[PDB]
Design a protein around this motif. Structure first.
Motif, PDB file in Angstrom:
ATOM      1  N   UNK A 194       0.822  -1.208   0.000  1.00  0.00           N
ATOM      2  CA  UNK A 194       0.000   0.000   0.000  1.00  0.00           C
ATOM      3  C   UNK A 194       0.857   1.259   0.000  1.00  0.00           C
ATOM      4  N   UNK A 195       1.962   1.252   0.745  1.00  0.00           N
ATOM      5  CA  UNK A 195       2.841   2.412   0.833  1.00  0.00           C
ATOM      6  C   UNK A 195       3.694   2.610  -0.414  1.00  0.00           C
ATOM      7  N   UNK A 196       3.462   1.821  -1.466  1.00  0.00           N
ATOM      8  CA  UNK A 196       4.188   2.001  -2.720  1.00  0.00           C
ATOM      9  C   UNK A 196       3.886   3.352  -3.354  1.00  0.00           C
ATOM     10  N   UNK A 197       2.623   3.776  -3.320  1.00  0.00           N
ATOM     11  CA  UNK A 197       2.215   5.005  -3.987  1.00  0.00           C
ATOM     12  C   UNK A 197       2.777   6.258  -3.326  1.00  0.00           C
ATOM     13  N   UNK A 198       3.348   6.143  -2.127  1.00  0.00           N
ATOM     14  CA  UNK A 198       3.926   7.304  -1.464  1.00  0.00           C
ATOM     15  C   UNK A 198       5.113   7.835  -2.257  1.00  0.00           C
ATOM     16  N   UNK A 199       5.272   9.156  -2.247  1.00  0.00           N
ATOM     17  CA  UNK A 199       6.337   9.792  -3.012  1.00  0.00           C
ATOM     18  C   UNK A 199       7.703   9.423  -2.443  1.00  0.00           C
ATOM     19  N   UNK A 200       8.668   9.239  -3.338  1.00  0.00           N
ATOM     20  CA  UNK A 200      10.048   8.874  -2.989  1.00  0.00           C
ATOM     21  C   UNK A 200      10.016   7.541  -2.236  1.00  0.00           C
ATOM     22  N   UNK A 201      10.984   7.320  -1.353  1.00  0.00           N
ATOM     23  CA  UNK A 201      11.066   6.109  -0.567  1.00  0.00           C
ATOM     24  C   UNK A 201      10.356   6.161   0.767  1.00  0.00           C
ATOM     25  N   UNK A 202       9.554   7.194   1.016  1.00  0.00           N
ATOM     26  CA  UNK A 202       8.874   7.352   2.282  1.00  0.00           C
ATOM     27  C   UNK A 202       9.666   8.074   3.349  1.00  0.00           C
ATOM     28  N   UNK A 203      10.898   8.485   3.054  1.00  0.00           N
ATOM     29  CA  UNK A 203      11.737   9.188   4.024  1.00  0.00           C
ATOM     30  C   UNK A 203      11.498  10.698   3.947  1.00  0.00           C
ATOM     31  N   UNK A 204      10.246  11.081   4.177  1.00  0.00           N
ATOM     32  CA  UNK A 204       9.885  12.490   4.173  1.00  0.00           C
ATOM     33  C   UNK A 204      10.470  13.194   5.392  1.00  0.00           C
ATOM     34  N   UNK A 205      10.747  14.484   5.235  1.00  0.00           N
ATOM     35  CA  UNK A 205      11.401  15.277   6.261  1.00  0.00           C
ATOM     36  C   UNK A 205      10.512  16.438   6.685  1.00  0.00           C
ATOM     37  N   UNK A 206      10.858  17.033   7.823  1.00  0.00           N
ATOM     38  CA  UNK A 206      10.160  18.192   8.364  1.00  0.00           C
ATOM     39  C   UNK A 206      11.155  19.335   8.501  1.00  0.00           C
TER      40      UNK A 206
END
Lengths: 78, 137, 77, 137, 137, 137
Positions: free
Chosen positions: D101-113
């Motif tokens: 399911x988390x495939x559609x997330x942008x990039x590898x999922x290592x989003x930052x703040x």
């Protein structure tokens, strides 16, 4: 331009990550009546005499090392 | 309160609530809605108006869990018939449900507290000693 | 304040009490404060009024430095 | 919502839903679709139009799991007949299903703040003090 | 004291308390309310007036656990009938319930204590020796 | 001693004490009150006057545990009926009860002991040798 870029990089290192960041894990969250960014003046007293303690044996206190801030000066000198 | 209504819970349980069972179900749903509200941190003034599907799902599942077993039993048998449930979570809101509920929290949840060294601060000791030596502009 | 052309021979006190004395006091308070600053007791931007030990330590750390500079400058003239 | 329809679920379960069972199945499928949507992070405006086969598979399997047992029973037996299930996953989706399911997330999922030191910043203190000494070009 | 009343507890338990059962339930609820008050740290002067839904849920749940089994029994069976409960908590509240009870605590709960080196401090030894050499202003 | 009375314990246990049962219950309650007093460190001169609800809850709970089983039985059965209690506390109280009792202790409980190097100290060897050479003021 390269000298100014090196100075800007040094300033970015010094302004964003130059102190040992104190972090805690294992304690509860959403405290202070589920703070909606209200009363930001918490004023948690933290001095040399003060000793932090929490009512949970699973609480862990970690520290984040900062940039040594030594290579930037040498690079700027070069 | 009351994020979810009683009709969809009845359809999910495939049963109809009546007498004190309806009152018990309503109380359980209100309690679970309060738990979800305090976990997420939001208020939801108009409860059954916005009420995203995630919180509706979470509260419905928690209410169903509470109704199925309020004492959090592990194994229960009656003669030939036996049934053994899984490990109950700490309270309600199984860890995946807790993670889903904490989505609405601002940023990544790494909120900080502003500490101080027991000092007030007076950033004017040295500025007001200047005497106007100009035209007053 | 205003500059009077006349000398107020018969009404000097009337002009003094309402134009010179307030300005004189306004200057005198600042001059007294800066004189106190010169002879030690540097302006404490941060002071703890709740802890006696911290206040004692802060008062014990008030090393006079500007007074030393003033004395050094005035002793060579 | 409603990523999947009810006919393919009926074919997968080899049964036909009627009375309140159809309503319960539709509600469960809508809940699972909402959970998949919130896990993936996408919206899918036209629900049964694009709806890739991966999310259809995930929601169908999760709905089947919920229909088979809503109480997450480990072992259930009635007299001579006995059956034991595996360990129920946290939430609704197994770790493989969650990873899919988390495939559609942008990039590898290592989003930052983007953090800050409590500063606004005024990049003009020193530039506007210049006085035009030319022809105004 | 008495954060919760007795009517909603009766609805939750789907029973009616009478004779010594009513008095026992009231005493248990008072004990649970006192424990919740001491855990949270607040006072709640008007007990059944503000009494947020979180503490009401906590006290109702703890009262239900106390009424269901006061001896903290793991497994109890009588003949063919058998039932096994989960692991009882140390206190009347599970660890998940304690954290939300501790929500009302100021800041993040990392309160500190002001230590000292056994010293009183006299910040006047050196200032009162000055002799007034001015006009007394 | 006697932080708690006997009427509220009777209501909590839903039974009436008579003959040596009343004396045994009173002795157990006195023992528990003494243990709570020594754990907390306070004295409570007027025992059933201030007696905060926390210590009343603790002593009533400990008395109930002691009366239910004085031998700290884990599992006990006679014939078809069986019962299995949880892990008994070490002395009398679970860790949560001990933590609640230790609330009344001064500071955070991190009391210290003043050590010494086996020295008395004479802060006068050098001051009394001064001979008065003034007017005696």
């Amino acid at each position: 331009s390269k000298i100014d870029k090196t100075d800007y990089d040094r300033l970015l290192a010094q302004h964003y990550n130059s102190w040992k960041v104190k972090v805690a894990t294992g304690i509860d969250d959403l405290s202070e009546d589920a703070t909606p960014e209200e009363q930001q003046r918490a004023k948690l007293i933290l001095a040399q005499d003060d000793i932090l303690m929490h009512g949970n044996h699973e609480a862990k206190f970690y520290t984040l090392p900062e940039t040594s801030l030594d290579g930037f000066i040498a690079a700027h000198t070069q | 309160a009351g994020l979810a209504t009683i009709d969809e819970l009845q359809t999910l349980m495939s049963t109809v609530f009546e007498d004190d069972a309806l009152e018990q179900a309503q109380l359980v749903l209100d309690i679970v809605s309060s738990w979800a509200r305090v976990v997420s941190g939001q208020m939801w003034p108009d409860a059954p108006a916005n009420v995203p599907d995630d919180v509706r799902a979470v509260v419905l599942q928690a209410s169903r869990r509470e109704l199925k077993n309020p004492d959090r039993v592990i194994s229960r048998q009656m003669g030939p018939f036996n049934v053994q449930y899984s490990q109950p979570p700490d309270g309600f809101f199984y860890p995946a449900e807790l993670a889903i509920l904490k989505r609405f929290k601002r940023s990544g949840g790494l909120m900080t507290v502003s500490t101080s060294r027991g000092e007030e601060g007076r950033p004017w000791a040295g500025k007001t000693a200047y005497i106007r030596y100009g035209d007053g502009l | 304040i205003e500059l009077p052309d006349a000398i107020s021979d018969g009404e000097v006190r009337k002009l003094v009490e309402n134009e010179f004395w307030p300005e004189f006091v306004r200057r005198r308070e600042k001059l007294d404060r800066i004189a106190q600053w010169a002879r030690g007791e540097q302006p404490d931007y941060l002071i703890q009024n709740a802890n006696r030990e911290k206040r004692a330590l802060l008062k014990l750390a008030k090393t006079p430095w500007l007074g030393l500079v003033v004395t050094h400058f005035t002793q060579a003239l």
